[PDB]
Amino acid sequence: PRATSGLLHTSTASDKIISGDTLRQKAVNLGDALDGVPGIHASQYGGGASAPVIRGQTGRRIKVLNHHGETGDMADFSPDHAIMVDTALSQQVEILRGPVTLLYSSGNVAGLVDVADGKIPEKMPENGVSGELGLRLSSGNLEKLTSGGINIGLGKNFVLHTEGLYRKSGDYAVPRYRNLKRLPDSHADSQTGSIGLSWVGEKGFIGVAYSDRRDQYGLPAHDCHADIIWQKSLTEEDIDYDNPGLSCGFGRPWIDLRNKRYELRAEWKQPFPGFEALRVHLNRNDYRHDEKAGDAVENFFNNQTQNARIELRHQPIGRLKGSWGVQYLQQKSSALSAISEAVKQPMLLDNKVQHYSFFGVEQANWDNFTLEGGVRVEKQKASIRQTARSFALSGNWYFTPQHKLSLTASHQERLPSTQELYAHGKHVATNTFEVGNKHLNKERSNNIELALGYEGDRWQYNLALYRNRFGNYIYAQTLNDSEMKLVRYNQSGADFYGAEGEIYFKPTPRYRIGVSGDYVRGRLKNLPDDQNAPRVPAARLGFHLKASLTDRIDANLDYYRVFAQNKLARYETRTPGHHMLNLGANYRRNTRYGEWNWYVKADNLLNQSVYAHSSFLSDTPQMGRSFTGGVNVKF
Ligand SMILES: CCCCCCCCOCCOCCOCCOCCO
Ligand SMILES: CCCCCCCCOCCOCCOCCOCCO
Ligand SMILES: [Zn+2]
């Protein structure tokens, strides 16, 4: 029961490790799967994509990690783009805060979400072989989900791994929504495949893996353009482009996406003198997606990623431990239209971004108190020159482990993305024109958080209180007057604070009852007044029940009270306001050749009109009542 993302273990009390067997019974998308963990919401976008929203932050203010590596996707661009991780094929998903975030990115203020996978075995399987098989169906979805993974000892110290998943799902049923049985364009198909090969220790393991993922899914709530769009708008010619928006007023939207991945991992256990561990990670990621209407492409998306990170763990110099590393990340990306680059300027013109990053964490241990500090300094070059310095310092006081009090502080700098300073074009799915800013200054943030945790047979609880102070908070500022939005990229200050927590009391070791909840406030302060921050979540209180009876069978009930959101940003609207009731049960079973984990799930029994203010489809109801039956065969 540990975490893997940091070569050196810095553990704060508000760290959460979700089990992989459990994820097999969860939604396919990352954001839907993590929703329900206190402090984490979702930005759904039909059955296709959903991003986690963590402490009101999302995208570039958090970090999704594909087994310590850059996923290489383009989900940071907009929540309609799927995140390239397979949580249903994952070993574990760890949600981490602290100085560790500095190992992977700059500007990560809310949480690091690392998805660890079986791609490259790291260990020799028993009996020479191991793997699992999974199958499930879901009502009103209409989800079919099959999955498998395999590990084979190709000899004495050699292991091959394969794994894959195929999913088909329809437009989802909606309660009371218009006169519709199902919400149009919310269907989703996905396949993933991996082949791996890895060594064994001592000292460690080395290995490579090839992956392939094709996604095909609709764009819910959704011909003339080649001129007027450009050129051009700085400044006020939105006057002249939504005049011919009602001229053509008076295809079928979907995304076809392909992701190809080549990576290498290695990590052995006593590299040479003075060091306890050495860890490498090489990655190449081919990402593409066409945003289409029928068979025609409206936007071409591309993101080539190459990523390298080397981390070594130094000798404990007398109870102070540390891991220092270097990372190289180059990312070639573009976002084009059917229109040539010879007539119009692309939404995102073809660009070359390079990240040179030096990082590390150091922890000192004075018995029942740990102190870990962290740093990151990355330089960027941007062919078509700044530096981000981020630091974090954190203390943990164990009165009696486990009785945890964490105090964590950090200053993080995020360098602006090329999208943010150079965007200039209609993104169809979002029906928004995007404009960049030639002069943004880095996102600087000063963050403080205190977490408290106890888990002691009778009582179990987890609490966290946080504030995030931005001297600079870069945001997509909606602009001057169901047409098409226009956003400019802007700067101000911001003040985010909130709380999240869960507490469980078990009367017997047999039964467990619990209450959970979260709340977050987001404000824009000091504008070039004092308005709310965009797409902030809503408060949520949770009631939880879970009980085994017995040895194999495990029923469970989850009731969430999602309150409305009336603290809204510049052009936002109110969002109710729903009651989520979820039922669940599980079958544990031991036959020959495998453990057989049957499962049955019932979500949204009250059949409520569910809206999420934190999503781009805030006035679009999400899935009504749905039944799920599934099987897993571990072996
Ligand atoms: C036990 C059920 C497992 C089913 C696994 C499905 C098989 C995995 O599919 C992987 C291939 O997915 C399609 C890849 O296509 C990529 C397109 O690249 C061609 C471009 O020239
Ligand atoms: C820190 C909570 C556990 C009990 C602390 C008392 C023991 C020593 O703590 C004093 C200094 O460290 C406290 C935590 O440090 C936070 C780092 O903030 C640095 C901001 O510049
Ligand atoms: Zn898009």
Side-chain angles (χ1 to χ4, degrees), residues 25 134-137 587 597-601 628-632:
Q25 308 185 356
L135 164 75
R136 76 150 137 161
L137 295 188
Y587 194 147
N597 273 286
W598 287 6
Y599 66 89
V600 156
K601 192 167 186 176
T628 295
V631 185
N632 285 103

Side-chain angles (χ1 to χ4, degrees), residues 19 41 52-53 66 72 108 132 148 151 153 220 243 249 255 281 290-291 319 340 343 397 404 411 474 509 516 537:
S19 173
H41 293 357
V53 174
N66 188 350
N108 189 351
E132 85 159 32
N151 301 283
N243 276 343
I255 277 184
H281 180 280
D290 307 64
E291 307 199 326
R319 286 169 85 97
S340 88
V343 189
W397 186 0
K404 290 179 186 158
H411 174 76
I474 307 180
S516 65

Side-chain angles (χ1 to χ4, degrees), residues 45 74 77-81 217 219 255 289 291 299 301 347 427-430:
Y45 209 98
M74 283 176 95
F77 197 94
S78 61
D80 77 87
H81 309 166
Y217 61 88
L219 303 177
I255 277 184
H289 84 238
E291 307 199 326
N299 301 128
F301 270 77
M347 183 168 68
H427 185 206
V428 300
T430 316

Side-chain angles (χ1 to χ4, degrees), residues 119-156:
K119 260 73 159 293
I120 311 188
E122 297 181 25
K123 154 166 183 228
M124 294 300 293
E126 290 195 286
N127 310 69
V129 285
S130 70
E132 85 159 32
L133 243 56
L135 164 75
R136 76 150 137 161
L137 295 188
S138 294
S139 163
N141 206 347
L142 297 115
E143 188 177 41
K144 170 195 297 180
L145 174 80
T146 86
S147 52
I150 303 301
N151 301 283
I152 307 172
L154 196 280
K156 186 176 301 272

